Amino acid sequence: MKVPEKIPMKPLKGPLYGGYFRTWHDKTSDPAEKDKVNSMGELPKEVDLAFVFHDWTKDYSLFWQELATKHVPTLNKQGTRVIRTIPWRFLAGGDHSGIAEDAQKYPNTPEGNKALAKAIVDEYVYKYNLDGLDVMIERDSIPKVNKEESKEGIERSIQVFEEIGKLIGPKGADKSRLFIMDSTYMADKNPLIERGAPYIDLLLVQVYGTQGEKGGFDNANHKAVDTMEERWESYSKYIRPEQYMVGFSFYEEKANSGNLWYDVNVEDDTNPNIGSEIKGTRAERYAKWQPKTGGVKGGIFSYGIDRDGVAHPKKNGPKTPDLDKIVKSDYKVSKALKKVMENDKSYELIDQKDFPDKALREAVIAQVGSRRGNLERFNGTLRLDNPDIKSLEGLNKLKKLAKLELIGLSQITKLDSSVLPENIKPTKDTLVSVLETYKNDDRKEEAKAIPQVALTISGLTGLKELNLAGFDRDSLAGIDAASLTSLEKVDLSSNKLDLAAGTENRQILDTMLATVTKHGGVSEKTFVFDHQKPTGLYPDTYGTKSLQLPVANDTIDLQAKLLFGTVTNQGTLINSEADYKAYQEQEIAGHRFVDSSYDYKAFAVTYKDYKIKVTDSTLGVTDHKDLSTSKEETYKVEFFSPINSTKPVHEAKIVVGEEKTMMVNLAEGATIIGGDADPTNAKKVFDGLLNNDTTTLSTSNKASIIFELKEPGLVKHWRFFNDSKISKADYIKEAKLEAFVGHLEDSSKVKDSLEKSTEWVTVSDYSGEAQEFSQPLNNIGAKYWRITIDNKKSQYGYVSLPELQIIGHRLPEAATVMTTMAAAEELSQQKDKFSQEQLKELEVKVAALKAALDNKMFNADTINASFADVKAYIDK
Ligand SMILES: CC(=O)N[C@@H]1[C@@H](O)[C@H](O[C@@H]2O[C@H](CO[C@H]3O[C@H](CO)[C@@H](O)[C@H](O)[C@@H]3O[C@@H]3O[C@H](CO)[C@@H](O[C@@H]4O[C@H](CO)[C@H](O)[C@H](O)[C@H]4O)[C@H](O)[C@H]3NC(C)=O)[C@@H](O)[C@H](O[C@H]3O[C@H](CO)[C@@H](O)[C@H](O)[C@@H]3O[C@@H]3O[C@H](CO)[C@@H](O[C@@H]4O[C@H](CO[C@]5(C(=O)O)C[C@H](O)[C@@H](NC(C)=O)[C@H]([C@H](O)[C@H](O)CO)O5)[C@H](O)[C@H](O)[C@H]4O)[C@H](O)[C@H]3NC(C)=O)[C@@H]2O)[C@@H](CO)O[C@H]1O
Numbered sequence: 001m002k003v004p005e006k007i008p009m010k011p012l013k014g015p016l017y018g019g020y021f022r023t024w025h026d027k028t029s030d031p032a033e034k035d036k037v038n039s040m041g042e043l044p045k046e047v048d049l050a051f052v053f054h055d056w057t058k059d060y061s062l063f064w065q066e067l068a069t070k071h072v073p074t075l076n077k078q079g080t081r082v083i084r085t086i087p088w089r090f091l092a093g094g095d096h097s098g099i100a101e102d103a104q105k106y107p108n109t110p111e112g113n114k115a116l117a118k119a120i121v122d123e124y125v126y127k128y129n130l131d132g133l134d135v136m137i138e139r140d141s142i143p144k145v146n147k148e149e150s151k152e153g154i155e156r157s158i159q160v161f162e163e164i165g166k167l168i169g170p171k172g173a174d175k176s177r178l179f180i181m182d183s184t185y186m187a188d189k190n191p192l193i194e195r196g197a198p199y200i201d202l203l204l205v206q207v208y209g210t211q212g213e214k215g216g217f218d219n220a221n222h223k224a225v226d227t228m229e230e231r232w233e234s235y236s237k238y239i240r241p242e243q244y245m246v247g248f249s250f251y252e253e254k255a256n257s258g259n260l261w262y263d264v265n266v267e268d269d270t271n272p273n274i275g276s277e278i279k280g281t282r283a284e285r286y287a288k289w290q291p292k293t294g295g296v297k298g299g300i301f302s303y304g305i306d307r308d309g310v311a312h313p314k315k316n317g318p319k320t321p322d323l324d325k326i327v328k329s330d331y332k333v334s335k336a337l338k339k340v341m342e343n344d345k346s347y348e349l350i351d352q353k354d355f356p357d358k359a360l361r362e363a364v365i366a367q368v369g370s371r372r373g374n375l376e377r378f379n380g381t382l383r384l385d386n387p388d389i390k391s392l393e394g395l396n397k398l399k400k401l402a403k404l405e406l407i408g409l410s411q412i413t414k415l416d417s418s419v420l421p422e423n424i425k426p427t428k429d430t431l432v433s434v435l436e437t438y439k440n441d442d443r444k445e446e447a448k449a450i451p452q453v454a455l456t457i458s459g460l461t462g463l464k465e466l467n468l469a470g471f472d473r474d475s476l477a478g479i480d481a482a483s484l485t486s487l488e489k490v491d492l493s494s495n496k497l498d499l500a501a502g503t504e505n506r507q508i509l510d511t512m513l514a515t516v517t518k519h520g521g522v523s524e525k526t527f528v529f530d531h532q533k534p535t536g537l538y539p540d541t542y543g544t545k546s547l548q549l550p551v552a553n554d555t556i557d558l559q560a561k562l563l564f565g566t567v568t569n570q571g572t573l574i575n576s577e578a579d580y581k582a583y584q585e586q587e588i589a590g591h592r593f594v595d596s597s598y599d600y601k602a603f604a605v606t607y608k609d610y611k612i613k614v615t616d617s618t619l620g621v622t623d624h625k626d627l628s629t630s631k632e633e634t635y636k637v638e639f640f641s642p643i644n645s646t647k648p649v650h651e652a653k654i655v656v657g658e659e660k661t662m663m664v665n666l667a668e669g670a671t672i673i674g675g676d677a678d679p680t681n682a683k684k685v686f687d688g689l690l691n692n693d694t695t696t697l698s699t700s701n702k703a704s705i706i707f708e709l710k711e712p713g714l715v716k717h718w719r720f721f722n723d724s725k726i727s728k729a730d731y732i733k734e735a736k737l738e739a740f741v742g743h744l745e746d747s748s749k750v751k752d753s754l755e756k757s758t759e760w761v762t763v764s765d766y767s768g769e770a771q772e773f774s775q776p777l778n779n780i781g782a783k784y785w786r787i788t789i790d791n792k793k794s795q796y797g798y799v800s801l802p803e804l805q806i807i808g809h810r811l812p813e814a815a816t817v818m819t820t821m822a823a824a825e826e827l828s829q830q831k832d833k834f835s836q837e838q839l840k841e842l843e844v845k846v847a848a849l850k851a852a853l854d855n856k857m858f859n860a861d862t863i864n865a866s867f868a869d870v871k872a873y874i875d876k
């Protein structure tokens with residue numbers, strides 16, 4: 001088989017029309033199968049990319065000889081690339097992977113992956129001298145081993161995908177061949193987009209049907225999911241807009257439910273040619289569709305292009321079998337969609353009518369895109385550093401630009417709304433979608449607000465006028481006023497500028513009064529900056545971090561004294577209605593700038609929906625704003641925003657009376673050793689989420705739990721809760737907390753079975769009806785604890801325990817400290833050992849240890865060091 005060499009072709013220029021041709025519908029596929037009458041080589045020149053879609057076709061067939069020798073030269077002459085399409089499995093190996101089936105020749109090694117990639121290109125691209133590769137990434141081609149999805153093969157396809165990219169495509173050694181990824185996944189559900197995007201020329205999305213157009217429907221929230229724009233926004237992170245092509249599908253003969261797409265016209269007996277019309281169909285909609293942000297798309301593609309013109313059977317109507325008959329295609333729908341995209345105004349080339357300055361036009365074209373549709377949609381940064389630009393005429397055609405940088409434009413002498421992007425001011429989206437939406441939602445969407453373009457002026461020596469009034473510019477940043485030397489008249493009114501103190505804007509403002517004082521022309525007409533409405537923001541940090549208060553029977557407002565204030569984007573802090581009144585009547589060059597109408601109510605932020613959490617040294621949590629100083633206590637105050645109920649915005653320390661050390665929850669994360677309760681829900685007692693995110697209970701009448709502390713230490717307090725007033729009269733009414741001191745009946749191997757029997761000590765015996773119970777404990781150093789609860793109900797009583805806290809100070813090896821102090825206090829008890837006086841050296845050193853253990857300011861060093869003191873004398 002003599003494969004002719006590639007003929008010259010023109011470069012690809014958008015918009016592009018692609019089409020998958022099914023090999024088993026070529027005449028040369030199966031000579032016996034005489035009902036197939038179409039040919040791949042008869043695709044019109046409107047087809048830019050012709051995808052070869054091989055399955056159900058013989059390997060020894062004459063179609064391959066026909067394609068390499070006739071179809072490829074024929075389509076290349078009219079400018080049509082012929083692309084070979086392979087499934088995702090071919091890049092991984094395993095079930096039905098083509099070349100990769102020979103694992104011995106191409107193993108899963110770094111050298112094997114490199115060699116497999118070359119074999120893939122040699123076999124699927126270079127063998128018949130095709131124009132590119134197209135890897136197909138969907139569930140229908142996911143790598144599998146023994147019919148189950150292979151997470152190991154998926155990883156290999158990523159490595160092979162890059163290795164293919166180093167051979168063909170935009171970053172490959174051979175850039176004459178395309179490398180394309182068609183897919184059904186959203187970019188986050190696509191394992192290969194993240195590393196494959198730099199290596200691919202184009203990217204196709206298989207958005208077929210009304211779900212492909214309108215997206216899926218979230219029946220819970222009555223909202224659309226995975227919409228067209230959402231799908232594009234996911235892939236817009238990895239590829240450019242001019243690489244994104246959407247796709248519809250024609251009617252496949254004898255297609256079953258789940259493969260009906262209705263992307264073309266539905267059949268009509270009164271028009272035997274309605275299928276070849278394209279008006280109002282999902283195919284034309286996709287042709288006319290453009291993303292709202294970033295730039296025009298690459299084009300559209302069609303699957304089953306051999307069935308062009310065939311009308312789609314009715315959804316629930318009587319069956320029509322003449323549509324399943326195979327006829328020769330004239331590809332009228334394919335040509336019509338090509339013309340619809342070419343004649344679309346969004347692809348009109350940018351010419352001198354838009355930007356008369358040729359130095360300006362070239363910069364825009366080389367940065368925004370050659371088409372007028374990119375002006376409405378470009379979403380990035382435009383940098384104009386070519387000094388030859390004489391006229392900025394036409395920058396108001398830029399609608400969604402994100403950053404504008406004017407660098408060293410000496411010949412520009414005026415800047416107003418007519419020579420700036422229209423989103424210099426707050427604007428809304430004016431583009432209308434052509435796709436259908438969900439009739440099962442409410443009325444159609446409202447205009448989305450377009451973010452304002454960032455303006456950077458620097459080096460504009462010749463600039464004489466700078467008019468920016470009424471634009472709601474948030475600050476004056478990016479303006480290098482020191483280089484704007486020829487300015488004469490400037491307007492900055494009706495903005496949001498905090499022109500005060502030594503603010504950035506106020507320093508630009510004042511550097512700019514200079515260049516129109518050196519320039520003696522200054523009137524009340526030439527420099528206007530009044531009617532300023534700076535937006536008020538929540539302060540990033542708050543001032544008061546600590547408060548030492550005396551003990552006295554008086555409540556204080558915690559939020560009032562700790563969390564207040566409004567901060568501008570330049571640094572000014574306003575706390576009261578008076579601070580804003582002193583800020584409001586602040587003059588610059590004998591003239592106020594803040595608007596009169598803009599009052600304190602409209603500027604300062606509000607703390608109506610803010611929440612407070614006050615935790616004391618015993619981990620007792622309260623949510624009330626007021627705080628009674630009637631008890632000596634050290635607290636911990638946190639404030640939370642409505643937008644975030646987990647991360648505090650300001651944290652503080654309140655010390656009433658003398659400062660007590662804050663105790664921690666020693667049982668948080670406890671390991672369940674044994675007991676009667678369901679182990680799944682026993683862990684929820686010690687997990688930490690304050691009384692249980694709607695989880696469940698322990699046993700059916702009366703539960704016991706035996707647990708081990710993560711890090712043992714000094715235990716001073718304990719606390720347990722009932723359910724969140726979710727229940728009433730079902731509360732735990734009898735509780736028994738126990739500590740373990742029976743050393744250990746050995747069996748370190750089997751803790752639990754002897755934990756279940758040995759000698760424990762009752763430390764608390766609760767009996768009540770409260771929702772929360774807390775009680776001090778007398779310095780226990782145990783590491784194994786037992787809790788027993790009972791709600792005084794039927795044998796099917798279903799007792800619950802959402803959370804239980806063992807509260808104290810983290811003291812490593814506190815068990816040995818308590819046992820030694822017990823061994824010393826009970827040994828100086830017996831004054832008959834020796835003289836009472838010589839062992840007073842131990843009697844005074846034992847109350848130093850005890851006072852250190854009971855001090856409000858728990859000092860770990862003072863206890864560990866003083867522990868060794870009594871340890872020496874018991875050693876004697
Ligand atoms: C961008 C895009 O669109 N992407 C996808 C796209 O793929 C979707 O299009 C579909 O693609 C189908 C091909 O997918 C394969 O290739 C993909 C890429 O290569 C890949 O991603 C897929 O995963 C899939 O891969 C193949 O997977 C199979 C399964 O594992 C592999 O098969 C195995 O192969 C090994 C050898 O290696 C062994 O032989 C195993 O035994 C075998 O199982 C295969 O290797 C994989 N391929 C590769 C390359 O790895 C495509 O087929 C779909 O098109 C069909 O359906 C439409 C309608 O929906 C129809 O219009 C099409 O013409 C086509 O219909 C088939 O036509 C065949 C050609 O004639 C025909 O095959 C012959 O049938 C004969 C008739 O036989 C009987 C019988 O003997 O029992 C006769 C009975 O009377 C009849 N009963 C009836 C009619 O009631 C039954 C029927 O067949 C019955 O329905 C049983 O189900 O059959 C005879 O048997 C001949 O011997 C035989 O050769 C087929 O029978 C029909 N099939 C049907 C269902 O009609 C489709 O386009 C696209 C769609 O939206 O979008 C994305 O998903």
Ligand SMILES: [Ca+2]
Nearest residue numbers: 684692802803
């Ligand atoms: Ca809990």
